[PDB]
Amino acid sequence: KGEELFTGVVPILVELDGDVNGHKFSVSGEGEGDATYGKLTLKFICTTGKLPVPWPTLVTTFLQCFARYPDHMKRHDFFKSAMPEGYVQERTIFFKDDGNYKTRAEVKFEGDTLVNRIELKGIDFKEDGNILGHKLEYNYNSQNVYIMADKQKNGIKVNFKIRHNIEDGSVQLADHYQQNTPIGDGPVLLPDNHYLSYQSALSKDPNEKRDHMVLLEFVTAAGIT
C-alpha cells in the first residue's frame, strides 16, 4: 500500500510559504522522483521576486519518500509506509551563530502527484550575517542523516546538521531537528536506526530569468546490520 506507489517515475509539486524576519516569500517547485534509484529532479522558483535567503538554506526543506531503500532494509522505509495518506514533517533548523527556521510540511499524494505543502518561519537573523546578507556559496556538501524511530509519536525522529560553505573559507552550521508523523489512521513502518546518505548538486537553468534553483539529489539508505 506504499512501496507500490513509488515503483516508477513520480510527479511532484511543492509549495512553500515563507517569512524570514518579517520577510514574506513564496516558492513553487515541480519535478520528478524515482525511489528505485534514490533520485530527485526538481526546479524551484521564487514566485514573489528575489528570494531573501540563500537557496542552499532551503535545500533540506525542499521528500524522503523518494529515498532508495536497499532490499534488505526495506522494512525500515517509514516514508513510503505512510502513503498514500502521508505525513507531517516538522523541523527546526538553527543557524549556528545566527537565526533559526521553523518548518511544517505536509507530504502526500494528490491523485498521482506527490505534493509537499510547507510553511516556514524565520526569526532572529542578523541582517549582515551569512544568511540575510547572502554569503553562502551556491553548492552543497554531501552527508548522512540518522534516522530513528519515535514510538510515542509513532513516527520518527531525525537529528543532523548541514555545513554550508562560505567564501570566507569557513562554513555555516545548520543544525536540524525533525519529527515526522503519520497523517493517517493506518499502519506504518517504524525503522531501526539507520541513515540516509545524501548527495546534492545545485544548478541553474540558463534560460530562466527568475530567481530559482535547479536541484538534483540522490538519496540512499544504509546503517542496517
Domain tally, the chain: 1
Over 118-165, what HEC string results? EEEEEECCCCCCCCCCCCECCCCCCEEEEEEEECCCCEEEEEEEEEEE
Task: Confirm if 145 and 158 have CB atoms less than 8 A apart.
Answer: yes
- The boundaries of the domain holding residue 136 are 1-225
If we measure between CA atoms, which residue out of 82, 114, 93, 102 comes closest to residue 181? Answer: 82
For 191, the grid coordinates are 525503522
- Would you state the cell numbers that stand for residue 211, as one nine-digit string? 530567481
Phi, psi of 7 (to 5 degrees): -55, -35
The C-alpha atoms of residue 101 and residue 92 are separated, in whole angstroms, by 5
* Cα 220-69-118 angle, rounded to 5 deg: 70
CATH of the domain at 46: 2.40.155.10
Q: 1, 85 in Cβ contact below 8 A?
A: no
Query: Nearest Cα to 92, choosing from 120, 125, 64?
Result: 120
Residue 66 φ then ψ, to 5° = -85, 10
**Approach to solving:** X-ray
Buried b / exposed e over 37-59, threshold 16 CB at 10 Å, is: ebbbbbbbbbeeeebbbbbbbbb
Kindly report the three-state secondary structure assignment for every residue of 71-111: HHHHHHCCCHHHCCCCEEEEEEEEECCCCEEEEEEEEEEEC
- 3-state class (DSSP) for residue 1: coil
Residues 80 and 75: their CA atoms lie apart, in Å, by 10
Phi, psi of 75 (to 5 degrees): -70, -20
